[PDB]
Design a binder for this molecule. Sequence first.
Ligand SMILES: NC(=O)c1ccc[n+]([C@@H]2O[C@H](COP(=O)(O)O)[C@@H](O)[C@H]2O)c1
Ligand SMILES: NC(=O)c1ccc[n+]([C@@H]2O[C@H](COP(=O)(O)O)[C@@H](O)[C@H]2O)c1
Lengths: 465, 464
Amino acid sequence: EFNILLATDSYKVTHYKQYPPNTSKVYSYFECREKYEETVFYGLQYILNKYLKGKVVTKEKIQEAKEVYREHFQDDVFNERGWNYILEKYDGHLPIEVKAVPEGSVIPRGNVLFTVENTDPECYWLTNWIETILVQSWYPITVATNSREQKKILAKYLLETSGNLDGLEYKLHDFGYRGVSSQETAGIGASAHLVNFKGTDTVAGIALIKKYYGTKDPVPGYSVPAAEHSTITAWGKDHEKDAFEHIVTQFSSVPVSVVSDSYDIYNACEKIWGEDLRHLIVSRSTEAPLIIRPDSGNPLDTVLKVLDILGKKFPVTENSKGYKLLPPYLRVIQGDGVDINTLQEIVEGMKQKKWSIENVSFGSGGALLQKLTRDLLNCSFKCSYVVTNGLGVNVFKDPVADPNKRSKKGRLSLHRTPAGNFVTLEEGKGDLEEYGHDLLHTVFKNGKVTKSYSFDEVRKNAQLN
Amino acid sequence: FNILLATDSYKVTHYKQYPPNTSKVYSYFECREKYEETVFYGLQYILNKYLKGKVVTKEKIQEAKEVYREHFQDDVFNERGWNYILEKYDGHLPIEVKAVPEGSVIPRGNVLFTVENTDPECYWLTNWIETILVQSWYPITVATNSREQKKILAKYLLETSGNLDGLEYKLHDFGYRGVSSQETAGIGASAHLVNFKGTDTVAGIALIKKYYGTKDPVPGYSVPAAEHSTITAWGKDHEKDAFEHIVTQFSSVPVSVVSDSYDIYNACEKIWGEDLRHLIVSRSTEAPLIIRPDSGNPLDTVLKVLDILGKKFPVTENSKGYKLLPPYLRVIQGDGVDINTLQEIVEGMKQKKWSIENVSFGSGGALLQKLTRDLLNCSFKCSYVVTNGLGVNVFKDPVADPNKRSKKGRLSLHRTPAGNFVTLEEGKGDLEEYGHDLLHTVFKNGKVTKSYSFDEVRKNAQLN
Ligand SMILES: NC(=O)c1ccc[n+]([C@@H]2O[C@H](COP(=O)(O)O)[C@@H](O)[C@H]2O)c1
Ligand SMILES: NC(=O)c1ccc[n+]([C@@H]2O[C@H](COP(=O)(O)O)[C@@H](O)[C@H]2O)c1
C-alpha cells in the first residue's frame, strides 16, 4: 500500500527541527510564475482523493517510515512523535486546509492557484511536508494547458477555412500511451487532454475520470479502429494491397484509420487507395470514412503531397470559404511529428495551399503527454506566511541573481478586477474588501474533500473564448 | 489494474487485421541508431508488477467489454480471445520474452528483448502488450542518461583529484516533485540508483527492494538539508539566525543549507564566511557544511561562490595541482544541472583550477522528467510471423525515412571476435558462426523465469 509518510522529498523529514521555535502556522501557495499566458487549473482533485483524504496515517505506516528513514539517513531523524499525534488526535486524518480555484479554471500566469496551511498549531511542519505530493499537480495542469493552446490554433484555422468549428473536439488525438513514463502518468496525462478533446487511445484516462470526477456520458473519450505497422507489414511487402483491402473490408461500416507509410506513402495513396482499391473507398459512408495515416517524413511536406495526390484521384469540392475539400468518405490523420509548434506550421501551410483544415485531423503522443516539464509554466510552491510567537510574519524569497524567482508575501487571495481580469492580493490586503470575494474555495480540510467538480464542470470551465 | 485496459485503444481492433491463418507474431525492442550505448534496465519491474500470474478474470473481461463498447460505440472487443486464455491457462499469458541481462550496457541498434506468442490462437497477444512493455524506454533512458553523466563526473574527478573516491555520490536525485506522477518517481529514482547512491525520492528504494532486492545496507542515502521555506520562515533580517540554528541542530552530520534566498554571495562571504565562520571550521570531515546555491547562471555562480569561500577559508592545492576547500566545507549545485551544463560546469571549474572534489550536483526534472522515448529511439516492431505454417520475415521501410527501417526475421544477439556486439537477423543466429545468443528467456506463460538482484544490475552497468 501507499504510505504518505514515504511520499515526500527525503530532506523534508528533517525540516520540523529547522523552523523558528514556537511556530504555530506555515502557509504556502502554488502559482505558475510569470507563450502560455493562461493556465488550466486541473488535477488537484485527483491527488486530494487518491492520496490525501481519510485515514492516511496508521501505526504500521509510522513504523514502516521509522525503519526506512533510519537506514536512508543512517540515523533516527524521523519525526515519530509528530505523526503519532495526528494518529491519536485526528484518527490519522491530516489537519490541513487547502483552498483552490475551481478545477478547469483558466487563470493568467502569476496568480495564486491554491494554498495550503495547517489547522493545528502542533502540525506546523505538515504544510510543506506535502509540498512534493501537491506540486505534481503541475503535470495535469501543464498537459491540459498545452492541449488547450493547440485547440486554439486548430479552432482558429478550422473557423477560417470552413466557417465553423464542427468536430473541433476530435481534431487532436491522444497517441501518448507508450510514450509516457508510467501507467499512472498515462492516466493523469490522458485525462488532462480529455479536458479539451474527446479522442484518445490512452484508455487509462477514462477510468481516472470516472472514479475521480465523473461524467454524464458513460464515457468521456472515444476512438476508432486503426491499423499499425505490424498488421500491415505482417502480410509481406508485396501484399500491402491485400492488407489494405482486408482491413477496410473488416471495418466497412465504421471509420477506419490505416497507416499507409510502411514502404512508400505516396505509392500507397496514388496507386493502392487511388487506383487498385478506389472502388472500395468511394462506396463508403460519410459516417465511416477511410482515414489515411502517414507516419514519416517532414510533417507539412508529407501532408501537402498526400492531399495533392488524393485530390488528383478523388472528387474534390470547394467549400463556401473557398477551400478545397476531399469527399466525405475520405480523410487524413497526421500522427507523427506533431507538437504545438509544428501543428501551427501544418495548418498554416495547408491554408496557403487552400486546403480546408476539415481534411486533416491530428495525433500526438510523447510531445503531448511526456515532453513537458514543471518549468514550462514555472509551477512553484512557496511559503509566504507563518505565525511564530503568536505574530504573523510575511515571508518570501528573492534571489539576487534572479528576480523571476521572487515569491509573493503574506496571506493571499485571488480576485476579479472591474475590467474582468484577475489579481492576486498579497499581505492579506484581501481583507480590505476592495475587490469583491476571493475566488479560491476550500476544497480540503482536516482529512475531507469539502468541494469537488464533475468532469463536465471542468470542461465547461476550460472552454475557449 | 486490468491488463485488458492497458493498451493503446486501436490494438483492441488488431486481431482482425492480421493475415488469416497466422499462428505466430514475433516482435522485438531496440534503441535504434552521444548515447552510443544504453543501460537495459526496468523490464523486470514491468513483468512482475503487470504481466505475471493470473492477469485475466471473468470480471476483468466483462469490465473491458463494457468500457470498449462505449469507447468504440461498437463491440469490437475480442472477448472470445481473452476468454480462451482464461479457460486454457487460468488467466496466464501465453507469451515468451527473451532479453539481455538487466543492467547490460549495449550499443545502439541491437535487439534488447523479443516477444512471441506460445499458443497459435494468441497470435494477437504479442503486440497487445507492446504498449506496456514499450514503457521500459523510461527506466532505460533514465539509467542511460544518468550513466553518461557519471562518465563526465568520473573523467574530471580523476583528472583533478587523481582518484574516483565518492563518485557514486556526486549526482543527487532531486526529481520527486518534478516528475509527472508517484509511480514515475519510483521508477525513475530506481533507474538513477543503478549508477549513484544519493536520492531524495524514497519511493525508488521500495521499488528496488521489492522488484530486484539488494544485499545492501544502504541502497540509497540522503542527508539533512534546508529548503527556502525553512530559511525564509525566520524573516529576511534573520537569515543568519536560521543558518546558525540549522547547523547546530545538525552539528554532527553532513548538512546542506540553501543559501540563495536573498543574496547567495552575501551569505557565503559575510554570514558563512564571517559571522558564523566559527561554527563551520569546527565541524568534522564526516559532518561538513554543504553550501547550496540555487539560482543564477550555474557555472558563473559556482565559480564566484568558490572564489568567495577560497578567500574566507584555508585552501589547499592537491597533488594534481587543483585547489581544495577544507574538509568541513563543500558545495552542491542543485539548479540548472543537466547532461550539457554539467559538462560546462566541471570544465569551467577545471580551467579555474578547482578540484571537482569541491562540488557535487543535484538534478531534478532534467534527470527524471525532461526525457523522451526518441532520445534513444526506443522502438517495438514485428519482425517475423508464421502464416499458413510458413515463416515470413517482416519489417517496415518508409520511403521518407531510412532511419525508421526495422530488422527482419528472427533475431539473436552475439559478441563479436573483437569483443563487440552484433544482432543477427533472419534466423542466421542458427548458423552458429558466433557464440551463444546473449538474450535469455525471462518470461514464459505467466511465469518470470529469470531474475536479477539490484546488485547484479549495478555490476552489469558499471563504468569503463
Ligand atoms: N490509433 C493510432 O493510430 C495510434 C495510437 C497510438 C500510437 N500511434 C503511433 O505511435 C507513435 C508514437 O510516437 P510519438 O510518441 O512520437 O507520437 C506515432 O507514430 C503514432 O502515430 C498510433
Ligand atoms: N535536498 C535538497 O536540497 C533538495 C531535494 C529535492 C528538491 N530540491 C530542489 O527542488 C528543485 C527541483 O527543481 P528542478 O526539477 O528544476 O530540478 C531544485 O531547486 C532543487 O535544488 C532540493
